[model samples]
Target: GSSGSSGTGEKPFDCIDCGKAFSDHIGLNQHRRIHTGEKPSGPSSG
Candidate 1:
C-alpha cells in the first residue's frame, strides 16, 4: 500500500482587510474589493 501524504495545513494567501484566508490570490483579490471598493476592469462589472 502507498503511504498517504499530509494536507497543506493552512492557506498561503490571507486577507489583511479581514479575518479571512484564501487558497489562491484570485480569491483574496476578490475579497479585498469589498473593502477597497475596487472594481474589475470589464464591461458591466460590479
Candidate 2:
C-alpha cells in the first residue's frame, strides 16, 4: 500500500500490537504473520 489513497487507499486497519496501519483487512492479516513468526513452506527458486 502507498500514499494518495483517495477512495480505498485509506489505511484504516490499525495494528493493535505495533501501531502499524494497513489499507485493508487482508493486509492486516498478512502483517500479523510477522508477529506470529509464520514462515513460508514452499521451495525457493534461488
Candidate 3:
C-alpha cells in the first residue's frame, strides 16, 4: 500500500527571485548577484 508521491531530492540552495538552484551556498551567492546587479571589486576598480 503505497501512494504515488514525488520524493525526489531538490537543490540545497534555491534562488527566490529566479527560482534557480545551485549546488551550494557559495554558488547561490554568486548567482544572486545577477538579480542584485552587484559587482565584486577587483583590480579594475582601481
* Candidate maximizing lDDT: 1
- Candidate 3: worst-modelled 10 consecutive residues by lDDT: 1-10
Clash counts for the predictions, in order: 0, 0, 0
Please give, for residues 5-45, the per-residue lDDT of candidate 2 as tens digits: 46654677978867788878999989887777754466962
Model 3 lDDT per residue over 1-46, tens place: 4354686356789888778777799999998988787655877843
Give the better candidate number (1 or 3) by lDDT.
Answer: 1
Residue 12 lDDT, candidate 1, scale 0-100: 85
* Best model per TM-score: 1
- Predictions: Cα RMSD each: 10.0, 8.0, 11.4
For candidate 3, the TM-score is 0.53
Arrange candidates, best TM-score first. Answer: 1, 3, 2
lDDT of 3 at 43: 79
Cα error, residue 24 of model 2, in Å, equals 0.3
For candidate 2, the TM-score is: 0.49
Tens digit of per-residue lDDT, candidate 1, span 1-46: 3244686457888888676778999999998888796556878755
Clashing pairs in 3: none
lDDT-best of 2 and 3:
3
Model 1 regions lying over 4 Å from their true place: 1-8, 38-46
lDDT of each: 0.78, 0.75, 0.77
